[PDB]
Amino acid sequence: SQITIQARLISFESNRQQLWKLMADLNTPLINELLCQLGQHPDFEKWQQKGKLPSTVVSQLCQPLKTDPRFAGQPSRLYMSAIHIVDYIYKSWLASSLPFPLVFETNEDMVWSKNQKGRLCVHFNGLSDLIFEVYCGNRQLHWFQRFLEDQQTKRKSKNQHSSGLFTLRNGHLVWLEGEGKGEPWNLHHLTLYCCVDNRLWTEEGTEIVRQEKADKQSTLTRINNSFERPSQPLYQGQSHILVGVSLGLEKPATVAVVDAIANKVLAYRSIKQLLGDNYELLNRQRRQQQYLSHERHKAQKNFSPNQFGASELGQHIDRLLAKAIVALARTYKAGSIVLPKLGDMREVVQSEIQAIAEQKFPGYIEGQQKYAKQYRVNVHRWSYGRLIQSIQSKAAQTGIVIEEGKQPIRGSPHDKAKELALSAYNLRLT
RNA sequence: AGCGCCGCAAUUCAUGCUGCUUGCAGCCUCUGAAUUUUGUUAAAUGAGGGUUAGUUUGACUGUAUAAAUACAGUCUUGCUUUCUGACCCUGGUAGCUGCUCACCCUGAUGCUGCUGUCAAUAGACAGGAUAGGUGCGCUCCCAGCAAUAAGGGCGCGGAUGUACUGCUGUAGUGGCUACUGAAUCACCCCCGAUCAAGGGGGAACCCUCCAAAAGGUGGGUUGAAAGGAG
Known about the structure:
Blueprint lengths: L1 E9 L2 H13 L2 H12 L4 H5 L7 H7 L13 H18 L8 E3 L5 E5 L5 E5 L8 E3 L2 H19 L11 E9 L12 E9 L5 H11 L27 E7 L5 E7 L4 E4 L3 H5 L3 H20 L14 H19 L5 E3 L6 H15 L4 H14 L5 H15 L3 E3 L8 H16 L2
Parallel strand pairs: 8-11, 11-12
Antiparallel strand pairs: 1-5, 1-7, 2-6, 3-4, 6-7, 8-9, 9-10
The structure holds one RNA strand.
């Protein structure tokens, strides 16, 4: 699946300042001016009647800005970066003191080469003089090494390699703000974000992609190419087994590995089981959540800038749950991980508070509402969207599917997980 | 008092265990779920602001496997995050500034709360998280204040006046920028780059050999995990 890999690009002060002048003082002005000229263009409104502006506008407004004196000329790929950035920003709008990123559509825009010291280096097409190396960890090193090897593998074939099978597919070159003062090229740390596809790493995965990619002069000309390709068996997840993930307030995500054929349950993996040594994180996140809503509502107008919202502990917990759920779907050979819909979750939470209140104080409504009010204080709504996103990401990475479900309104959390998995299996026939 | 968490107990169980008839039967050593109970000089959550290009969390190749996986060997690079651990501080001055304030009444997802000494409310040297609630946390409670939610009272110089200000400072409390002191570590320590870069020196535990023991070798562990950037 798609995944973005980071790397710190490193070169000398001369090359860095050259790039800085190109971007911050000769292309960031280009970006801003193209943005206003999009704003100050006579037929601005007529396109909003459709709600989308096609690629025509930037295509015709790209070239008049080549010889504008304040721009001092850019390499062609930097013009492509600018036009793609304005495309991205106006698409994000139609729904700081830091230069706009650089956008590279394909890998051929990046040339890789080993130096005498052995490290990988990357230049960009149309630049050819800046020798930005690549800095990264082992979790990313094999990625860049494989990009270099595929580059070396296309040239030996006299450039008869299809571009899709290449591992690296996109790339973002951005500056990142830091501390200190002085010049900003030696202050903002350049970083390369590489977008790849794991589906195109394992040899079996690579051979999977050829069939649909044909779906016309060179449609099948250079499909077959060996590369260097590790062969690892594709994870063949058998169906008939679903891992429902009941989402709730007190138990945010409890799973039950259901064998739906005989309605037998294979594994009631609770959250204390889905997290292990990471269970201590769960309550911790709530300790932060109850904190934030206390401070966020305190400064009602958001006037006071404080540190609330400090950590991404929710993100880490949520991806930990994703990893554990996919691992526990593998261990029982599950053919899906089942999640409910966030659209059908606003009522689920409130039904849960009401049911817990009734089971704690039966009939005594004036005490039921009291208990519910002090229960909303202590246990807050989970970041369910992050959970669903991270679980879908890990499921795509490993290969298991995510299908829609329908959480039951009442019952035990394990009972809700089991019945949610069964409901998803029932909907699977549809 | 109330509520959420933690797991100490019991009970009932299984998602757990036993040779099966392979789905049933039986019992709670390991792994857990629920209900109730309990808070023990006990188990386990939790406990303030920062700090590493940190270690493990990798990839490939042969074997074993019905396999998650284990071993052997080759390479290795540092990106962004989460814990844990260790460590450092609870900032100094120079500005732009917020936000509120006759005196009152209860009081608000209102504010503050650590030990100790001097000292007088208000706070200075020095310790430092174990920062009020004896299991822990809290929009709950308490102690204090409340001008810094409301909301309702109520006043001296003034107003052409019908509105509004003084009693508002030589305050209380939050932001922004700049110069600044300590950590700049992941077994410990020294030297370096922090657009690059690693190399020394050492202690704790090892597997094994020279022998006969000790001692002296070769290799290895000295916390782990996660990741799609918008």
